Amino acid sequence: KVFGRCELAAAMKRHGLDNYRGYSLGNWVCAAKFESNFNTQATNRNTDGSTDYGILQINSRWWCNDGRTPGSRNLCNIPCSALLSSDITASVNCAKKIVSDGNGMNAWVAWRNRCKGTDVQAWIRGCRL
Numbered sequence: 001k002v003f004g005r006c007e008l009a010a011a012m013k014r015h016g017l018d019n020y021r022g023y024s025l026g027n028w029v030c031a032a033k034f035e036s037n038f039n040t041q042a043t044n045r046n047t048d049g050s051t052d053y054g055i056l057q058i059n060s061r062w063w064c065n066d067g068r069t070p071g072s073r074n075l076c077n078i079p080c081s082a083l084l085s086s087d088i089t090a091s092v093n094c095a096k097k098i099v100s101d102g103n104g105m106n107a108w109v110a111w112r113n114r115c116k117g118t119d120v121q122a123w124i125r126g127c128r129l
Helices: 005-014 025-036 080-084 089-100 109-114 120-124
Strands: 043-045 051-053
Touching (some): 051 080
Antiparallel strands (some): 043 051
């Protein structure tokens, strides 16, 4: 599924991401925009044997198990295919873990390069939440 900006904002809101660990909802929508262009089926296969999965491009070395990645830790305790659903629940639950496992939003390269230092509230401006 390819989400709309406001649709995604509301879904993330329903799942508790606004002000999760101090990160306002627009940070999360911004991160999804530049990680996957809001595509729940996005995959990026890395040359290091890992793969980035789903709307938040969660990586298979640390966070989910795809059975093909060396040094896999599966800290979200989920198969990576759960992150490719049209329902964003598994991705949000894992994203919460990624912040809770001590790193902040700097875990998402697209967030740090394209959202940090910008007006992230624009990503939810005009939306019904």
